[PDB]
Amino acid sequence: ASVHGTTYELLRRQGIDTVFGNPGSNELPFLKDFPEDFRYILALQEACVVGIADGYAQASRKPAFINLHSAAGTGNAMGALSNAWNSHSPLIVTAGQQTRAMIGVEALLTNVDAANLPRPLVKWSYEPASAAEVPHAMSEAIHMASMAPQGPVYLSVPYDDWDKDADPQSHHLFDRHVSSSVRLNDQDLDILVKALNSASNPAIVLGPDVDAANANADCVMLAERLKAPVWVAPSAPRCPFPTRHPCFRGLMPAGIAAISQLLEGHDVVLVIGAPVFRYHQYDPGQYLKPGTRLISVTCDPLEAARAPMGDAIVADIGAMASALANLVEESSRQLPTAAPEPAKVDQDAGRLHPETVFDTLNDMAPENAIYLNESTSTTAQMWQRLNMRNPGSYYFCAAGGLGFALPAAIGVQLAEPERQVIAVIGDGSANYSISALWTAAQYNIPTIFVIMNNGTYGALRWFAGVLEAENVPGLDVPGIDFRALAKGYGVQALKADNLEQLKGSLQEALSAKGPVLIEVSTVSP
Amino acid sequence: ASVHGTTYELLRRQGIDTVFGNPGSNELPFLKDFPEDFRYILALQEACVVGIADGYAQASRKPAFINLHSAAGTGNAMGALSNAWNSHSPLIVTAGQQTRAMIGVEALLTNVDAANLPRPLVKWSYEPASAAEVPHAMSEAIHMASMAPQGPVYLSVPYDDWDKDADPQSHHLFDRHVSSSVRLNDQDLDILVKALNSASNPAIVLGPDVDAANANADCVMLAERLKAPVWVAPSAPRCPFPTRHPCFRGLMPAGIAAISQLLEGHDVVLVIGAPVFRYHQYDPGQYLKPGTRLISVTCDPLEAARAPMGDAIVADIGAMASALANLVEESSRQLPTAAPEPAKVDQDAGRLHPETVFDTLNDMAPENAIYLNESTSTTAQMWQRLNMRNPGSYYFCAAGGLGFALPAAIGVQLAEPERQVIAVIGDGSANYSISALWTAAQYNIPTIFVIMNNGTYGALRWFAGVLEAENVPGLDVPGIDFRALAKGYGVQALKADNLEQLKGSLQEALSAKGPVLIEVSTVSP
Amino acid sequence: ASVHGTTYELLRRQGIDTVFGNPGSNELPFLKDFPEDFRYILALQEACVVGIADGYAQASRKPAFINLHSAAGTGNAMGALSNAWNSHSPLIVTAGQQTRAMIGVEALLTNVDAANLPRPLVKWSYEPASAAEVPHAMSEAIHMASMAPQGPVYLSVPYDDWDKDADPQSHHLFDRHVSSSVRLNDQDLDILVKALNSASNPAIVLGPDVDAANANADCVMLAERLKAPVWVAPSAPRCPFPTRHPCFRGLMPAGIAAISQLLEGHDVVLVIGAPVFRYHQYDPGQYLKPGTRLISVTCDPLEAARAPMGDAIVADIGAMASALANLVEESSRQLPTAAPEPAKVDQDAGRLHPETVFDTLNDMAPENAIYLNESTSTTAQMWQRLNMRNPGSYYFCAAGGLGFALPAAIGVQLAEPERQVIAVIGDGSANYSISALWTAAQYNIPTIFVIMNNGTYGALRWFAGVLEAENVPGLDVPGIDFRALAKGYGVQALKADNLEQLKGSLQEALSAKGPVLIEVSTVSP
Ligand SMILES: Cc1ncc(C[n+]2csc(CCOP(=O)(O)OP(=O)(O)O)c2C)c(N)n1
Ligand SMILES: Cc1ncc(C[n+]2csc(CCOP(=O)(O)OP(=O)(O)O)c2C)c(N)n1
Ligand SMILES: Cc1ncc(C[n+]2csc(CCOP(=O)(O)OP(=O)(O)O)c2C)c(N)n1
Ligand SMILES: [Ca+2]
Ligand SMILES: [Ca+2]
Ligand SMILES: [Ca+2]
Ligand SMILES: [Ca+2]
Ligand SMILES: [Ca+2]
Ligand SMILES: [Ca+2]
Ligand SMILES: [Ca+2]
Ligand SMILES: [Cl-]
Ligand SMILES: [Cl-]
Ligand SMILES: [Cl-]
Ligand code: NA
Ligand code: NA
Ligand code: NA
């Protein structure tokens, strides 16, 4: 067998059937004779290729396979890899290299020092020392991306390798199963359960790896048994809990002092599936107040090591959430009462307040909608105003890197064809990966893109205002016609300058058979 | 003085007055109180920011300064850095880091292991160990980018550093001058000159560092004295010689065997300012034929070390070209005769042959036009059909990384406001950095963008056809309306479906007062 | 031809005829059929292998070739590589890798991520992508080590490559000549010469690259014409000037404030072949005083970029020293007067003062002796008390890394068989690379090793005393019998407990036909 044949067999035997790509000449010997059982999803720039694969992997809860062109294609994807690293996304990134005979002389399209290029944003990065090694290297890449803590990996392959003979012992790779589905040993788990049962005022904090594990329902059971309030850890890349459940208390502020103040009076704080903590603004103070102790359950040794406080347990989030949910006592305390609905903000017949937009989306969207957020000045409002009952209902760029939501929303919609995806994206953010719209049009992936157009980088302006920073350049982005950009890439486009038009545009988008972009005129910040 | 004040003084004292950027929160303390004598050029995505800075640096022959946001912004620029590395572009890339107090915990927007992120595509990469060190680190970055062989460098700065007190000894940095303007010692230069004077049939090969050095006119004198034919080294990022001078022989094919065959019968081949050689296709054979020896003059030790044949001298291209041009004898051989004009290809009243497009551009464009090429299947035609008399008249992505020409054409036009820039870009290539159009519109930088629309990745299809590679996915890019994309970003747009319309569109574009995009319907390959 | 045959031919054609090594199984296919015209120098640990090669390369002024075993052997050499980096030593370090078929599975003796292992202490680090590429990679390694600024490089080779067929085009590598023998262009050199001619009170500072270039005699002519005092730059790895010439002023103190004070009143300070500056102690103050400006000539862009003050020129030290020495005017100022001889320190009939040891070495050693220093608390005394008239007469660990002088002294003695090498090494320093003594015994390389035994890490104790640092552990090294260690490795050994015995021991050592170790009882600090 050829390296090509053997590698596609390994991929299908390991459950991979889709290649997200932007092709090039070093990759043609891989992509030729493309197997009939595989599908190729083209995007026009590599940040888009990786963003689409990333949303697809996060929503499908399985690895996604990517093929890019040498150094320049890999390099165009590195901002996307920064997000994938922080969201633990299992991405197998492959890139074609020059023929082995011309690497030394550095022919055009040589990826120099290739394994170093994507570092430090990958778990594993490698170029094989021979063609026959390629299937083994691919196997090692698949398992490195898929084992906890999941994350992106990188494999560089010289283009002449694909047609060479494969090692006949490569078949032992095809059906390997690798498990990291582990939980704390019985004795120490009994100790943890006793600490939770004994707490007078426990609190629970959940992060993105809960939603990645589909541990959401077990976390609901855990919170109900402990009669405990539940927050989402700051800078949240995913939504790990039903946002109108009585225990839910919302998104934590991303500040040291704000979080210790929030947790004051809670004797035991159980954090599951989050870093401790993804702070953002510098809000110095106590990490925890006297009387509070913290216990973190994380799938990632790096998270356990870097936490500035608390104990930690490194284990699988699905297995730990299920064990805790089923082992803890039912507390005799009263169940927390649900937060009230957010108030309607005053809205005239002109430009839309973001609050109005979220309230209208919540009123009209199906109950199993999936949202993506890249509208950076409106995140708090979004979290308060969208009832997200189900797992897999929210995605936000995990490293704060813009250019994620537009392509990711297409990958999520591909992963979840029966759940309407609605991406809410600022006018600034929309540009970073604008060309991803073309992939939605070409494959008829019916994502709805809601562009919040306020003319400025609003979160940055707000932050400049707080700093009393004067004379900062580059904060305004006037003069972009998003309906024309959508037309440019073949996507139906609508505009909403007021609430009447927003309602009508949403009704039309929701009944459409393809992707739709709605440009919404929102109030200046 | 503050680190902020001291660093802007160092920048202006070292000739830097423009910041190319896409801003973020880690950068606000740098960008605040932005000095009145500086200008900020915003672009909407970081590949565009760096591409614009890169064209500006290459055309101005001086370093360009860039400011990006942490890891995600740096990562979005890494494909652009792959080109900048291969073109020796002097780029000072700065990125903001989290406040020093939250780096350890990996707060959101921490650039982890920051100096490793852009490697291996930078000459130098660093994050200072203290705020007071920032001006010294910036000084070291400026000189590392600017010394031969020039190239991109990277500096990561924690956002809290800018407001701290600067080291009072930082003033010694402000006026430092560093020279790499060197040439081979007299004795060995005399030996080289004697070898050239003695050659029976010399040939000259010139690469991009000739145009970077503005050594073009000296190379003309050298070729006239030696009565030698002149080729441009393969995969050419720049044009180093007047393309209708009698000695000119065109772009070399990027193949080992093709080049040795081309050079057969030439006893001494003098290569100046090029790698030996930037081959592309794998065309195995002899590196040189018997009877040919090669001498390379390069500014880059890495080029001298990796050449598979020939002697080499590592020195400044400007100084060596001037010395050789002035020291060699006038040969009694006959001057080479000019190549004939290329023939007119048959053209009907329908879609345009690329040859027709280049002939029409050559007929109408000013004699001091500057061209950029990212129309990958038409490069040979372009080189044959455009008379480029002057230095600085051609740019092509030096690493083959698409997404260069559209933003670079804006930077070149900014650098050369009295030379009309015309970027010829394929419909595939146009998407990678499409949002750069907005910067042309906003700052009214009057670049003309000619989009060659044939609906496909034509160079890849052609290469697949040569490989007899069947069933390759992802080669077609139908359904893009480039006039709508131009409208989206505020750029006047025209379409040319036939020659009459191409002529009219060019006449209108050439008389326009702002940027213009022309979508040209070209023949399918 | 085989890769083995082709690679040894490339080595001999490039002037390499000696392999310094400690062998292993990954290297056996390289070392088998070892050519009759080559010689192999074994050392018992890899810090010793590299130290011996390093002294040999520095003294011979040509590259040295090293062969080590995989990761563990490379790793044992990395302290030695830290020194080689700072001394610009041209070392070609090769290490054997596992067979290509077992790299992926990480068999025992796989060098994982091999090219990253020696970074950041090498100029170039690589593992070839195929066996046929090995000769080209070796060629690129040879030129990278040998081009200015010279330095160590690293090549990892899978053991199965050596027996494979070589590329038939590899012969073009054999005779390549690469020159970096360059100097500043005429116009700017004329400007520099005029600045020197015009100076009222110039000073000259010389570093190790002067001695590496054998530019010492040209620097003498330059100093005589300018009638200028000459200092050696701080932390000196080599001696660049005759130490009893009338212009000589000694080793500069390694402190910022001390150096600006020393240079006060000098209007132009010309630094040649040194970093600006290799400070050591933290002695904050002005980098230069008002009235002093600095001009650095360096072969190393990194040195020019990082200097905190002055102008710089990046060029070959040999070519620049020769041009300056021959172009400057003879000043009418009076020639500097020679420093007086150092005084005799009072010495009783007991333990030796280091001053007594150096005075006695100076009295008895031949005028063309070569000294090495790794007696860290006595460096100033050594520089004052040894008349070193000739180039290549002094070596000190360029990164301050102990374990250099003992092996390096053996390599220097191998390079200079007619100059008596005398290594003066502290009792602490002697242990780091003690096993190197065996190589001197086995090959009868007649180095003399003078062990200064004061029982303590004296420089560290002194520094602790200055810091008023109490209760520092680990400063004493009692209970080492260096005559027994010398006997252990086959080297004749002598002891000197007083001056009578020191004189007798030196007389015996100087007349010996093999290596000799003298253990000298020196005064406690
Ligand atoms: C790749 C990248 N570049 C720059 C930034 C810095 N940044 C954070 S928020 C923001 C503005 C986003 O503007 P927009 O999408 O319009 O939303 P708004 O803040 O107006 O709600 C920017 C530029 C970033 N996070 N990522
Ligand atoms: C960043 C990047 N991604 C992918 C490629 C691979 N590639 C080389 S040429 C090419 C097609 C360019 O198509 P187009 O601009 O339409 O020009 P044409 O070949 O049709 O003349 C592609 C995708 C590349 N060189 N750079
Ligand atoms: C490899 C290495 N380890 C540790 C040190 C730290 N160090 C510098 S000087 C010194 C002591 C040297 O003692 P010795 O050789 O006896 O000379 P003395 O200071 O007594 O003159 C030490 C341990 C070093 N420079 N290099
Ligand atoms: Ca409602
Ligand atoms: Ca906005
Ligand atoms: Ca990297
Ligand atoms: Ca014409
Ligand atoms: Ca095309
Ligand atoms: Ca004496
Ligand atoms: Ca000692
Ligand atoms: Cl157990
Ligand atoms: Cl000279
Ligand atoms: Cl000159
Ligand atoms: Na190479
Ligand atoms: Na950390
Ligand atoms: Na492996």
Side-chain angles (χ1 to χ4, degrees), chain A residues 374-378 400-402 425-430 432 452 454 456-460, chain B residues 22-25 46 69 72-73 76:
Chain A
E374 206 165 275
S375 175
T376 40
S377 69
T378 64
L402 305 180
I425 302 169
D427 55 321
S429 290
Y432 289 81
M452 303 287 274
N454 59 17
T456 186
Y457 288 143
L460 284 189
Chain B
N22 181 266
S25 59
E46 296 83 357
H69 177 62
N76 278 349

mmCIF file of all heavy atoms in Angstrom, chain A residues 374-378 400-402 425-430 432 452 454 456-460, chain B residues 22-25 46 69 72-73 76, ligand 1:
data_model
loop_
_atom_site.group_PDB
_atom_site.id
_atom_site.type_symbol
_atom_site.label_atom_id
_atom_site.label_comp_id
_atom_site.label_asym_id
_atom_site.label_seq_id
_atom_site.Cartn_x
_atom_site.Cartn_y
_atom_site.Cartn_z
ATOM 1 N N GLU A 374 -19.109 37.471 19.037
ATOM 2 C CA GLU A 374 -17.873 38.226 18.818
ATOM 3 C C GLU A 374 -18.263 39.713 18.716
ATOM 4 O O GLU A 374 -17.846 40.451 17.822
ATOM 5 C CB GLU A 374 -17.086 37.740 17.600
ATOM 6 C CG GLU A 374 -15.573 38.035 17.724
ATOM 7 C CD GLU A 374 -14.820 37.220 16.703
ATOM 8 O OE1 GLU A 374 -14.521 36.039 17.015
ATOM 9 O OE2 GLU A 374 -14.560 37.733 15.586
ATOM 10 N N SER A 375 -19.078 40.122 19.685
ATOM 11 C CA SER A 375 -19.571 41.491 19.798
ATOM 12 C C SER A 375 -19.072 41.893 21.180
ATOM 13 O O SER A 375 -19.759 41.709 22.214
ATOM 14 C CB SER A 375 -21.123 41.487 19.706
ATOM 15 O OG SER A 375 -21.692 42.776 19.915
ATOM 16 N N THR A 376 -17.838 42.391 21.194
ATOM 17 C CA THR A 376 -17.080 42.399 22.442
ATOM 18 C C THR A 376 -17.567 43.355 23.539
ATOM 19 O O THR A 376 -17.335 43.108 24.729
ATOM 20 C CB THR A 376 -15.580 42.658 22.126
ATOM 21 O OG1 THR A 376 -15.432 43.645 21.079
ATOM 22 C CG2 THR A 376 -14.945 41.395 21.595
ATOM 23 N N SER A 377 -18.265 44.439 23.169
ATOM 24 C CA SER A 377 -18.752 45.358 24.168
ATOM 25 C C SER A 377 -20.130 44.948 24.694
ATOM 26 O O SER A 377 -20.656 45.615 25.560
ATOM 27 C CB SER A 377 -18.799 46.783 23.606
ATOM 28 O OG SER A 377 -19.802 46.920 22.608
ATOM 29 N N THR A 378 -20.710 43.861 24.197
ATOM 30 C CA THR A 378 -22.077 43.510 24.612
ATOM 31 C C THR A 378 -22.202 42.165 25.301
ATOM 32 O O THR A 378 -23.331 41.659 25.504
ATOM 33 C CB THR A 378 -23.049 43.609 23.412
ATOM 34 O OG1 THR A 378 -22.697 42.641 22.428
ATOM 35 C CG2 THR A 378 -22.970 44.996 22.767
ATOM 36 N N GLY A 400 -9.579 35.352 23.127
ATOM 37 C CA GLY A 400 -9.934 36.730 22.824
ATOM 38 C C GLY A 400 -9.557 37.138 21.415
ATOM 39 O O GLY A 400 -9.616 38.307 21.092
ATOM 40 N N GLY A 401 -9.164 36.188 20.571
ATOM 41 C CA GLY A 401 -8.686 36.509 19.233
ATOM 42 C C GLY A 401 -9.834 36.668 18.245
ATOM 43 O O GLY A 401 -10.560 35.717 17.945
ATOM 44 N N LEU A 402 -9.991 37.873 17.717
ATOM 45 C CA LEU A 402 -11.094 38.116 16.783
ATOM 46 C C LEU A 402 -10.865 37.378 15.475
ATOM 47 O O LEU A 402 -9.719 37.119 15.076
ATOM 48 C CB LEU A 402 -11.258 39.638 16.571
ATOM 49 C CG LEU A 402 -11.437 40.385 17.902
ATOM 50 C CD1 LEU A 402 -11.593 41.883 17.609
ATOM 51 C CD2 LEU A 402 -12.662 39.901 18.730
ATOM 52 N N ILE A 425 -21.944 39.336 15.844
ATOM 53 C CA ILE A 425 -20.558 39.737 15.575
ATOM 54 C C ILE A 425 -20.480 41.238 15.379
ATOM 55 O O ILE A 425 -21.311 41.813 14.642
ATOM 56 C CB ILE A 425 -20.053 39.062 14.286
ATOM 57 C CG1 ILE A 425 -20.145 37.521 14.422
ATOM 58 C CG2 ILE A 425 -18.638 39.524 13.936
ATOM 59 C CD1 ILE A 425 -19.924 36.760 13.139
ATOM 60 N N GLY A 426 -19.541 41.915 16.077
ATOM 61 C CA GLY A 426 -19.372 43.356 15.920
ATOM 62 C C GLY A 426 -18.914 43.744 14.527
ATOM 63 O O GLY A 426 -18.300 42.924 13.834
ATOM 64 N N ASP A 427 -19.163 44.991 14.127
ATOM 65 C CA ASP A 427 -18.655 45.441 12.813
ATOM 66 C C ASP A 427 -17.118 45.401 12.711
ATOM 67 O O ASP A 427 -16.583 45.147 11.629
ATOM 68 C CB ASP A 427 -19.177 46.849 12.449
ATOM 69 C CG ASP A 427 -18.893 47.908 13.495
ATOM 70 O OD1 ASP A 427 -18.971 47.700 14.714
ATOM 71 O OD2 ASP A 427 -18.632 49.036 13.099
ATOM 72 N N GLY A 428 -16.405 45.579 13.816
ATOM 73 C CA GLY A 428 -14.953 45.446 13.767
ATOM 74 C C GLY A 428 -14.566 43.998 13.576
ATOM 75 O O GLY A 428 -13.772 43.666 12.707
ATOM 76 N N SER A 429 -15.079 43.128 14.448
ATOM 77 C CA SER A 429 -14.735 41.716 14.407
ATOM 78 C C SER A 429 -15.066 41.057 13.080
ATOM 79 O O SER A 429 -14.382 40.115 12.687
ATOM 80 C CB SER A 429 -15.493 40.992 15.525
ATOM 81 O OG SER A 429 -14.946 41.402 16.784
ATOM 82 N N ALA A 430 -16.123 41.507 12.410
ATOM 83 C CA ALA A 430 -16.607 40.841 11.199
ATOM 84 C C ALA A 430 -15.529 40.825 10.107
ATOM 85 O O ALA A 430 -15.534 39.921 9.264
ATOM 86 C CB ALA A 430 -17.868 41.562 10.660
ATOM 87 N N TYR A 432 -12.187 40.358 10.281
ATOM 88 C CA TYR A 432 -10.952 39.580 10.406
ATOM 89 C C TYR A 432 -11.023 38.329 9.542
ATOM 90 O O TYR A 432 -10.025 37.956 8.945
ATOM 91 C CB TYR A 432 -10.678 39.221 11.899
ATOM 92 C CG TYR A 432 -10.273 40.403 12.735
ATOM 93 C CD1 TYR A 432 -11.241 41.284 13.240
ATOM 94 C CD2 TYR A 432 -8.918 40.651 13.024
ATOM 95 C CE1 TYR A 432 -10.884 42.356 14.023
ATOM 96 C CE2 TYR A 432 -8.547 41.768 13.794
ATOM 97 C CZ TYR A 432 -9.530 42.612 14.256
ATOM 98 O OH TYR A 432 -9.217 43.714 15.025
ATOM 99 N N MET A 452 -23.427 43.633 14.398
ATOM 100 C CA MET A 452 -23.782 44.746 15.257
ATOM 101 C C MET A 452 -22.940 45.951 14.822
ATOM 102 O O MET A 452 -21.755 46.044 15.156
ATOM 103 C CB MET A 452 -23.413 44.405 16.727
ATOM 104 C CG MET A 452 -24.098 43.099 17.210
ATOM 105 S SD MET A 452 -25.901 43.302 17.506
ATOM 106 C CE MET A 452 -25.813 43.905 19.218
ATOM 107 N N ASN A 454 -21.919 49.539 15.059
ATOM 108 C CA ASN A 454 -21.866 50.823 15.784
ATOM 109 C C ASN A 454 -20.707 51.708 15.296
ATOM 110 O O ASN A 454 -20.461 52.773 15.875
ATOM 111 C CB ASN A 454 -21.811 50.675 17.330
ATOM 112 C CG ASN A 454 -20.621 49.891 17.818
ATOM 113 O OD1 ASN A 454 -19.644 49.707 17.070
ATOM 114 N ND2 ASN A 454 -20.673 49.411 19.098
ATOM 115 N N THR A 456 -17.426 51.473 15.434
ATOM 116 C CA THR A 456 -16.210 51.689 16.231
ATOM 117 C C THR A 456 -15.800 50.378 16.861
ATOM 118 O O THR A 456 -16.599 49.428 16.938
ATOM 119 C CB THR A 456 -16.469 52.798 17.302
ATOM 120 O OG1 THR A 456 -15.251 53.110 17.973
ATOM 121 C CG2 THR A 456 -17.485 52.365 18.367
ATOM 122 N N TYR A 457 -14.556 50.320 17.316
ATOM 123 C CA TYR A 457 -14.123 49.223 18.188
ATOM 124 C C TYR A 457 -14.581 49.591 19.608
ATOM 125 O O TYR A 457 -13.811 50.188 20.394
ATOM 126 C CB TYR A 457 -12.616 49.144 18.135
ATOM 127 C CG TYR A 457 -12.007 48.590 16.833
ATOM 128 C CD1 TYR A 457 -10.828 49.114 16.340
ATOM 129 C CD2 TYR A 457 -12.585 47.521 16.154
ATOM 130 C CE1 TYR A 457 -10.234 48.599 15.185
ATOM 131 C CE2 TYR A 457 -11.979 46.964 15.018
ATOM 132 C CZ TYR A 457 -10.801 47.522 14.534
ATOM 133 O OH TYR A 457 -10.176 46.997 13.405
ATOM 134 N N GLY A 458 -15.842 49.294 19.929
ATOM 135 C CA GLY A 458 -16.479 49.839 21.126
ATOM 136 C C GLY A 458 -15.858 49.424 22.448
ATOM 137 O O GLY A 458 -15.699 50.280 23.349
ATOM 138 N N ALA A 459 -15.470 48.149 22.578
ATOM 139 C CA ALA A 459 -14.853 47.690 23.825
ATOM 140 C C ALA A 459 -13.535 48.426 24.065
ATOM 141 O O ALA A 459 -13.175 48.721 25.208
ATOM 142 C CB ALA A 459 -14.603 46.157 23.736
ATOM 143 N N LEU A 460 -12.798 48.707 22.995
ATOM 144 C CA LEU A 460 -11.530 49.436 23.138
ATOM 145 C C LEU A 460 -11.746 50.862 23.496
ATOM 146 O O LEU A 460 -11.024 51.403 24.328
ATOM 147 C CB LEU A 460 -10.704 49.371 21.848
ATOM 148 C CG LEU A 460 -9.952 48.127 21.473
ATOM 149 C CD1 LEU A 460 -9.080 48.489 20.259
ATOM 150 C CD2 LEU A 460 -9.087 47.696 22.685
ATOM 151 N N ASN B 22 -3.141 47.288 14.122
ATOM 152 C CA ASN B 22 -4.537 46.959 14.495
ATOM 153 C C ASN B 22 -4.511 46.904 16.017
ATOM 154 O O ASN B 22 -3.740 46.125 16.594
ATOM 155 C CB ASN B 22 -5.005 45.641 13.873
ATOM 156 C CG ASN B 22 -6.425 45.332 14.242
ATOM 157 O OD1 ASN B 22 -6.699 44.614 15.211
ATOM 158 N ND2 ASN B 22 -7.356 45.917 13.490
ATOM 159 N N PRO B 23 -5.246 47.803 16.674
ATOM 160 C CA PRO B 23 -5.032 48.052 18.115
ATOM 161 C C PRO B 23 -5.700 47.031 19.007
ATOM 162 O O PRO B 23 -6.627 46.313 18.592
ATOM 163 C CB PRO B 23 -5.706 49.417 18.325
ATOM 164 C CG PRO B 23 -6.884 49.364 17.335
ATOM 165 C CD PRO B 23 -6.261 48.717 16.083
ATOM 166 N N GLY B 24 -5.276 47.003 20.267
ATOM 167 C CA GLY B 24 -5.916 46.162 21.259
ATOM 168 C C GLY B 24 -5.666 46.700 22.641
ATOM 169 O O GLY B 24 -4.913 47.669 22.824
ATOM 170 N N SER B 25 -6.248 46.040 23.639
ATOM 171 C CA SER B 25 -6.136 46.609 24.987
ATOM 172 C C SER B 25 -4.719 46.580 25.556
ATOM 173 O O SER B 25 -4.342 47.532 26.249
ATOM 174 C CB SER B 25 -7.123 45.941 25.936
ATOM 175 O OG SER B 25 -6.849 44.555 25.952
ATOM 176 N N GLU B 46 -4.582 41.552 10.751
ATOM 177 C CA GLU B 46 -3.138 41.723 10.896
ATOM 178 C C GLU B 46 -2.307 41.282 9.715
ATOM 179 O O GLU B 46 -1.200 41.795 9.529
ATOM 180 C CB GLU B 46 -2.673 41.048 12.175
ATOM 181 C CG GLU B 46 -3.278 41.710 13.438
ATOM 182 C CD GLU B 46 -4.677 41.271 13.833
ATOM 183 O OE1 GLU B 46 -5.320 40.456 13.112
ATOM 184 O OE2 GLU B 46 -5.121 41.767 14.908
ATOM 185 N N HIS B 69 -1.774 43.111 18.385
ATOM 186 C CA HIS B 69 -2.344 42.737 19.667
ATOM 187 C C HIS B 69 -2.003 41.314 20.092
ATOM 188 O O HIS B 69 -2.562 40.334 19.541
ATOM 189 C CB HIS B 69 -3.899 42.870 19.605
ATOM 190 C CG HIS B 69 -4.550 42.437 20.866
ATOM 191 N ND1 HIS B 69 -4.313 43.073 22.066
ATOM 192 C CD2 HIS B 69 -5.398 41.422 21.130
ATOM 193 C CE1 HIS B 69 -4.981 42.453 23.026
ATOM 194 N NE2 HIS B 69 -5.648 41.450 22.481
ATOM 195 N N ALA B 72 -2.895 36.544 19.432
ATOM 196 C CA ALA B 72 -3.844 36.328 18.341
ATOM 197 C C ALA B 72 -3.503 37.293 17.191
ATOM 198 O O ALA B 72 -3.575 36.911 16.033
ATOM 199 C CB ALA B 72 -5.280 36.554 18.805
ATOM 200 N N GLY B 73 -3.178 38.559 17.496
ATOM 201 C CA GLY B 73 -2.861 39.501 16.430
ATOM 202 C C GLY B 73 -1.547 39.120 15.764
ATOM 203 O O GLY B 73 -1.432 39.166 14.553
ATOM 204 N N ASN B 76 -2.213 36.099 13.523
ATOM 205 C CA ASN B 76 -2.894 36.411 12.257
ATOM 206 C C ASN B 76 -1.913 36.961 11.216
ATOM 207 O O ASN B 76 -2.239 36.938 10.031
ATOM 208 C CB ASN B 76 -3.995 37.462 12.494
ATOM 209 C CG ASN B 76 -5.294 36.859 13.024
ATOM 210 O OD1 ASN B 76 -5.510 35.626 13.048
ATOM 211 N ND2 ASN B 76 -6.174 37.733 13.456
HETATM 212 C C1 LIG D 1 -7.030 39.389 16.215
HETATM 213 C C2 LIG D 1 -7.334 40.519 17.140
HETATM 214 N N1 LIG D 1 -6.940 41.804 16.849
HETATM 215 C C3 LIG D 1 -7.224 42.825 17.701
HETATM 216 C C4 LIG D 1 -7.920 42.587 18.877
HETATM 217 C C5 LIG D 1 -8.222 43.717 19.849
HETATM 218 N N2 LIG D 1 -9.670 43.941 20.079
HETATM 219 C C6 LIG D 1 -10.492 43.419 21.140
HETATM 220 S S1 LIG D 1 -12.069 43.846 21.105
HETATM 221 C C7 LIG D 1 -11.737 44.723 19.723
HETATM 222 C C8 LIG D 1 -12.821 45.488 19.016
HETATM 223 C C9 LIG D 1 -13.967 44.644 18.497
HETATM 224 O O1 LIG D 1 -14.856 45.560 17.881
HETATM 225 P P1 LIG D 1 -16.327 45.063 17.465
HETATM 226 O O2 LIG D 1 -16.307 43.687 16.914
HETATM 227 O O3 LIG D 1 -16.902 46.115 16.535
HETATM 228 O O4 LIG D 1 -17.200 45.015 18.801
HETATM 229 P P2 LIG D 1 -17.534 46.165 19.878
HETATM 230 O O5 LIG D 1 -16.319 46.272 20.797
HETATM 231 O O6 LIG D 1 -17.838 47.437 19.100
HETATM 232 O O7 LIG D 1 -18.758 45.624 20.623
HETATM 233 C C10 LIG D 1 -10.421 44.703 19.259
HETATM 234 C C11 LIG D 1 -9.882 45.382 17.996
HETATM 235 C C12 LIG D 1 -8.276 41.270 19.194
HETATM 236 N N3 LIG D 1 -8.891 40.940 20.316
HETATM 237 N N4 LIG D 1 -8.015 40.271 18.305
#
